[PDB]
Amino acid sequence: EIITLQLGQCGNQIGFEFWKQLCAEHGISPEGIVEEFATEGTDRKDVFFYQADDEHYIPRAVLLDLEPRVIHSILNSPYAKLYNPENIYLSEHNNWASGFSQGEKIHEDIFDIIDREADGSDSLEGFVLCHSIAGGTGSGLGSYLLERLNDRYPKKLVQTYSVFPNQDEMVVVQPYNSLLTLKRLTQNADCVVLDNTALNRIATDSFSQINQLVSTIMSASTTTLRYPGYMNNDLIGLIASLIFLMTGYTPLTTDQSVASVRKTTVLDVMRRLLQPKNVMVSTNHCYIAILNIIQGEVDPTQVHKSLQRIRERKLANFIPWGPIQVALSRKSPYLPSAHRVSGLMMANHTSISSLFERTCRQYDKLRKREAFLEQFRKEDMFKDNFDEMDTSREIVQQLIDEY
Amino acid sequence: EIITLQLGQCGNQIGFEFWKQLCAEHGISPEGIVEEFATEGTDRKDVFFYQADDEHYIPRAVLLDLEPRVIHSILNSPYAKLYNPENIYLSEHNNWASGFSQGEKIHEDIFDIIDREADGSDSLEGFVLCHSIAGGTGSGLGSYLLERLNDRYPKKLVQTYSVFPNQDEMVVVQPYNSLLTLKRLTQNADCVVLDNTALNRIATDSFSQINQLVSTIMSASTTTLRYPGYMNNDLIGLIASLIFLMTGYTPLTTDQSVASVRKTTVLDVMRRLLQPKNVMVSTNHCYIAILNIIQGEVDPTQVHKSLQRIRERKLANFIPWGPIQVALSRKSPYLPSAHRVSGLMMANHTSISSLFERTCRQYDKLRKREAFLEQFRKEDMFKDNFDEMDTSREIVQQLIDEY
Amino acid sequence: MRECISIHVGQAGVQIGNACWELYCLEHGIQPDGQMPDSFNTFFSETGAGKHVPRAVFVDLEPTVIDEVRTGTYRQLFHPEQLITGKEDAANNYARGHYTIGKEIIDLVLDRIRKLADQCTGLQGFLVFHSFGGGTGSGFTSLLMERLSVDYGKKSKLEFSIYPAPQVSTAVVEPYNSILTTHTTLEHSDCAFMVDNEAIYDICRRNLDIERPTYTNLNRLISQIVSSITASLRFDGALNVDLTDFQTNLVPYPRIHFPLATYAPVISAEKAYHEQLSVAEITNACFEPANQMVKCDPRHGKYMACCLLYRGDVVPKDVNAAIATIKTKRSIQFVDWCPTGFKVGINYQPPTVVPGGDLAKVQRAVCMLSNTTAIAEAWARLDHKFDLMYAKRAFVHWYVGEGMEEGEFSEAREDMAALEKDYEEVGVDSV
Amino acid sequence: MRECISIHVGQAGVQIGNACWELYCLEHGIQPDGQMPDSFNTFFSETGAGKHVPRAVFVDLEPTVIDEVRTGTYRQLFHPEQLITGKEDAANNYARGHYTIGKEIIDLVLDRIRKLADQCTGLQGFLVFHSFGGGTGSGFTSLLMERLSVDYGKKSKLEFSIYPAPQVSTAVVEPYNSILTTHTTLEHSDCAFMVDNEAIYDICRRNLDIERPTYTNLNRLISQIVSSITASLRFDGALNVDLTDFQTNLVPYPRIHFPLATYAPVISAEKAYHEQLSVAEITNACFEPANQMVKCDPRHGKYMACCLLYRGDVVPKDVNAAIATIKTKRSIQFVDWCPTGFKVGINYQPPTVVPGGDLAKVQRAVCMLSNTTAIAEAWARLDHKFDLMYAKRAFVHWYVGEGMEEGEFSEAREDMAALEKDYEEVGVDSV
Questions:
Q1: Which chains pack against D, by 3+ Cβ pairs within 8 A?
Q2: 3-state per-residue secondary structure call for chain C
Q3: Beta-carbon neighbour count of residue C47 at 10 Å?
Q4: CB contact under 8 A, B168 and C241
Q5: Residue B347: helix, strand or coil by DSSP?
Q6: Is B27 annotated as ligand-binding?
Q7: Where in this protein does the record say Phosphoserine is found (chains A, B)?
Q8: Among residues D156, D369, D262, D193, which one has the least CA distance to residue A95?
Q9: DSSP B48
């Protein structure tokens, strides 16, 4: 089992479309009813859903937000009735310090909800977090929740889908929020970086479609856990096999781009997952780990041949000081198999360091002139000084040095 | 069998909606007729009703009031014909002393009615009292009746649903009436505290709905007695297993809030009954006793597992000097079972002491300046002095010390 | 069963009674001839047929106002023998209404009140409508209240009095009559709901958009207050409040029994259309210092008791939330010896709109009777005016040559000084 | 839930409010009588029936404009008590609007604003519409803002002000009022979206083909800007932006809070037919120096923060590409301490065309709030004019004989000099 903590407008939407994808996959009706064709289903549902006496299924989700508008719109959607009104929380009434201050203020009810959800699962495995690191809501609230959660639950995993601000496109106060959120991520987060720049780049070459792609990534990541097989039957198995990450998915094709039914082997897919173009995020930098989850018919002989050929062709580079993985799953029996075989890749690669070097460069490009610090001084945390900022910057520098 | 003594506007209404709930549960027509579908019923009816030669059923209820308006409205309701006109009593023509004086004045007819009702039952078990402690009518009249009843019938139980005045919301003379009624309750009452503040708080988060909830509590408390089973087949069994009380009910859901048909185990319910939020009333204070009555399908294995887990999770605190209970009942076969399994909790907890500490603080906040004593001096009881008040205050202080 | 008798004394009392009984007839569906095309029992009596005779007396020492009643649209509603009138009024003189002219009428009034009481089964009490600064509204009111205390020494006696306004005034000798009435009735009264003409003028101008109101609009507002007060006796509600409830919850000490009346949803038709008047809104309007119907700023004193009488579509939880909000306010301060200063009454009958009135039809309303130490300033002003006029000994010959003595003037002034001292003492915090 | 109150002060503010509320009624389908034949909740309140009362006050010291509102087509939309008016205006005098005439009205305005705030559940902030070079638009605006800061010391206070134009001017004493208002409100304001009449005249002539525009067209364009700003509260979009978002992303230092408003698709019907206005095109138009609605050349200064509020058929990828193109431009330069100077908001509701207006119906639009150091030149011009007039001491007697002192003139000028110094300091590159 698992819980999802989505914050800010970004996280709220991310959750909306993630649950849309999930209910599509598992044959869950918009109202929580189960379709007749899926009555005898074999798919495991406990992982993301828990059924109710009324036979309806409820997501293990909690909605958090500093503002009402987004969630109010969500509850006007056809999927509104699905969520649990008890879990959803809205502030009665864009800065990280303010977000963390509110988090300190509204500890009690949030952790009440989290405890209630936790006690309903026998074998909870970890946490899932969806948020944006730039905006005031996501950054600060995620920081506070991560801190108090790592404190509260020292034996549960914490996974996040953190969305990073666009850089080629010029939050004016993004450097501070990003740097602080990164501090908290290093200091508490167990383990999926995301950026609007490269994401929209691949989308080209509304937020609805972008986050549909993101939800696709999340669902494909959690597929095998959802669909038990032989190997990789747990999230901890995933994490151990890799341990910051980046992702790529081959069949990112429009509903109109099915006309080119290209004979898609496993070799061509796994190859495509390697190119920098498909890496959805934007010094002979090299890899640390690679995982490829493959959906559809697959012959392990083909997998071995592809691995052999790629190894000989040396299209990849590895650390000199240490000695990939190809897991196979099964598609949901419901969504059309427009793709003969499909592939998702999650990897750890040193080049990601550059991200922080940019943000650090951004942050250093402001701290020398004290820009937009007036609001921060208002909050208690930065009321006296900003030693928090210095510690965070040095922590990020240490991480970059370690990479 | 049992008798109900309801006083004041509060008690009069309480009784109205309590009997509404009862007749709904037992399939009793508004006029006292029995529906065709319920002809072969197995439910026990003697407990709260006695049938008549005309086949109609009459409640074992008596209506008391200093004013006519409320009961006159009651007799204009569709349920008017159900009650017994003989038992109903109305004064021909807001202070505790006046109420007790009238009680002294109208002893004869009230006890005539009570004796007539008592002699019609072979195995009367106790008394039920519904009243408010603040208003003049309920407080004084209940005081007088309790005194003369404990004197008259030294071998019958006396149970009350006492409604306490709101405190966050500022009866101007409430401290006196409350303190005196508490004196009488300690000195004569066998055994259910109630407050408008927390009751309306939970209702939020007209008097019709509030008292509908209260009647729900009363009926759920008396269910197993109404519906014989194996264990807990008597009120005395209830009292012995606990012995001031507070209550909570899980499925307190609007008629519009059935849309979320949440899979409701027994574990989640019994857990919910523990939180201070669900306790309908408003120093490491701890419990004295806990009872949970569960309605619907129930597996004792589930009950044992829930008890084990809660014990290990130590969500509760107990007295260090002494060593709960989970009883099961069956729902009426008529009302829809919108809830898969439901739970009611009655507990004795030390924190209730605070209530009196407030009222004492209120009373002490007036006795030092002799506020609104002019009316009290009018009555004979407080004509000479107010030693009654001093004795009552010291008794309440002794009770608080004992807690 | 819970019958109550209303007594209207003087021109102010008689005209307020006209408005009140028009409102009662409209509320209970009674036609102005007493016939209907129970609830209507605490204030009306049935005589065989559909004729409903109101349970009231209209007493004045002047034939004019009573004759207007006798020939108006309600000419056949009142019993002709209960419209008691004299020949010569008291001429704004307390002595005339109490000693000289009032002694020739008090026996007839007491006989009629005895007839009404005998016709009743359980008498809750009396409602005395009068003005403080009138001849018969002061002297005859005090005489009647003392005779009633002699006769009905246990029934509650609530009086609706028009307190003299701080600035506007229609008579020159108002302080004399007011001080003497306060003396005599303060000896023999339970609680006096107070109201000012100036404050109601301000309320009408600010809320009802009327720039030229008459006594008719003032009487309609006062009648709405009285209807809200007596709704619990006349109708059925969640929380019933009787006259004895008022007396107990509003009077902390025998002399400090002068609450101020208030009515929240005083609003015109268009403004009522544009508003969403709710329980919280009407409660906040009740506690607004500008909506008081006695021209005394409540912020100058401390509340000792409040009686919120809601009516109509009112939910108890909303009332509790509004009262909690009021208690959390810092501008509204209570005395420290009253931790619980709210008596709450809820009625199911929404206020009835009089055809031709200015109040708009609303779904809910609240009347707030507040006993506060802010009335001490009004008492101080009244006794200051009395002290000036008595130091010059002006108009004293009119009172003395009519069965009174200057010793009574001195005694009344000393009693008012004692009342001011009592208000000061109850104002201070306990230590 | 996210209710916001708009305050319109003076003739300019009241007329801009007329345009704004016409636009709001058209956007939300509300008829000019408040009835409809949620989204309409941050700006309107429902009173029982379909009546929707706007959440605004129209305050002026002159009965003329408010009376035009009271008798116009929207005569039954606004609450009659929220159209506050005086008797004699401030006569282009800051002292009259702030000290002498404004003190007789500020209490009523604050009472009405308190009523509106109580009617709300969660108050986002205030929108103050006024002009810099007017009597009540300066003095009363400053007084009201300071009183609101005293009362609501935490809610955001965004003001839409008509900055005096560089060359055209309708009043002679505009520099005095502008400097004094800047002083007083700069003490107590969050951010001020600025606009010039001359710049909007130029925009109308160049884009809308109008050679003789009135104040009506200017007010329509300003109302379009305000609608684009508040669309996120009123509608649903991909990227929502609240008032606090504006305050945080546009104000780097407490004193430097004067962004400039812009609106890209200002185009006539025929030209709109011949064009293919896309996200890139409207963004480039927003950053064109000739499309600024404040007559300041942005190339003379450095951007410190931009807030692009797109609405309608807008795709986030197109917005990102357009913003990247803008950043790659060399004419558009940003300060070195703001590597990220773009707050982006996207709304799903295309702008609504007012029947009778000049703007053509478009599929998408963008409003750009830019904080830049080019406003420093406008401040320099304004204080130069102030320095000339004050050195000659012209018109100073009018201000002094109305509750002000020449010391206030000197203090305001020194504060403006400090503001110019602050703009100069934030302009320079970090070393």
A1: A, C
A2: CEEEEEEEEHHHHHHHHHHHHHHHHHHHCCCCCCCCCCHHHCCEEECCCCCEEECEEEEECCHHHHHHHHHCCCCCCCCHHHEEECCCCCCCCHHHHHHHCHHHCHHHHHHHHHHHHHHCCEEEEEEEEEECCCHHHHHHHHHHHHHHHHHCCCCEEEEEEECCCCCCCCCCCHHHHHHHHHHHHHHCCCEEEEECHHHHHHHHHHHCCCCCCCHHHHHHHHHHHHHHHHHHHHCCCCECCCHHHHHHHHCCCCCCCCCECEECCCCCHHHHHHCCCCHHHHHHHHCCHHHECCCCCHHHCCEEEEEEEEEECCCHHHHHHHHHHHHHCCCCCECCCCCCCEEEEEECCCCCCCCCCCCCCCCEEEEEEEEECCHHHHHHHHHHHHHHHHHCCCCHHHHHCCCCCHHHHHHHHHHHHHHHHHHHHHHCCCC
A3: 12
A4: no
A5: strand
A6: no
A7: 123
A8: D156
A9: T
How many Cα atoms are found within 13 Å in the side-chain-facing hemisphere of B28? 28
B261–A54 CB contact, under 8 Å? yes
Other Cβ atoms less than 10 A from the Cβ of C392: the count is 9
Q: Is B305 on the interface with A (CB under 8 A)?
A: no
Which residues have a Cβ under 8 Å from the Cβ of B285 and sit 6 or more positions away? Answer: B349, B350, B351, B353
Distance to chain D for A346, nearest Cα, Å: 24
CA distance C32 to C22: 8
Write the Ramachandran bin of C119: left for phi over 0, alpha for psi from -120 to 50, otherwise beta.
alpha
Q: Are C39 and C235 in contact (CB under 8 A)?
A: yes
Gaps in chain D with C–N over 2.5 Å, residue before each: 37
The dihedral over CA atoms of B151, B153, B157, B162, expressed in degrees to the nearest 10, equals -50
| Cβ within 8 Å, pair A53-B271 | no
The answer to the question of whether A220 is labelled as a binding residue is no
In angstroms, rounded to a whole number, what is the distance separating the alpha carbons of residues D82 and D79?
5
Q: Identity (one letter) of the amino acid at A98?
A: S
Interrupted backbone of chain A, residues before each interruption (C–N > 2.5 Å):
93, 170, 191, 205, 243, 282, 323
Q: Do A169 and D253 touch (CB under 8 A)?
A: no
Q: Among all residues of chain A, which has the CA nearest to that of D257?
A: A372
- Please report, for residues A55, B203, C281, the alpha-carbon distance to residue C326 in angstroms, rounded to integers and kept in the order given: 46, 21, 11
Helices first, then strands: H and E counts in chain D = 16, 11
> Could you give the CA distance from residue B152 to residue B108 in angstroms, rounded to a whole number?
13
Q: How far is CA A171 from the centre of its chain?
A: 20
CA dist C342 and C327 (Å) reads 10
Phi and psi angles of residue B343, each rounded to the nearest 5 degrees, phi first:
-140, 135
d(CA C245, CA B94): 4
Which residues does chain C have within 8 Å of residue B139's beta carbon, measured at their own beta carbons? none
**D2: CB partners within 8 A, 6+ apart:** A67, A68, A69, D42, D122, D124, D233, D242
Residue C313 sits at the chain D interface (C-beta within 8 Å): no
Choose the closest CB to C273 out of D45, D51, D118. Answer: D51
The span from the CA of C60 to the CA of C136, in Å, is 7
Rounded Cα distance, B313 and C373, in Å: 56
Q: Which of residues 16-75 of D touch C (CB under 8 A)?
A: 34, 45-49, 51, 53
Chains with at least 3 CB pairs less than 8 angstroms from chain A: B, D
The single-letter code of the amino acid at A345 is M
Is A343 annotated in a binding site? The answer is no
Return d(Cα D368, Cα B185) in angstroms, integer: 72
Experimental determination approach used: cryo-EM
Does B have 3 or more CB contacts under 8 Å with C? yes
Stated resolution in angstroms: 8.5
Q: How many other β-carbons are positioned within 10 Å of the β-carbon of residue B35?
A: 12
Query: β-strands C52-54, B341-349: how paired?
Result: unpaired
Q: Are strands C156-162 and C191-195 parallel, antiparallel or unpaired?
A: parallel
